[PDB]
Amino acid sequence: GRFKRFRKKFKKLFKKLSPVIPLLHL
DSSP states (O other): OOHHHHHHHHHHHHHHHSOSOHHHHO
16 A cells, blocks of 8 residues: 555554553543
């Protein structure tokens, strides 16, 4: 893909920002 696959890559960085807490994300 292109911009779509790129989004998934950037999301991986955003995940690192959260303290492994699915609560703040949900």
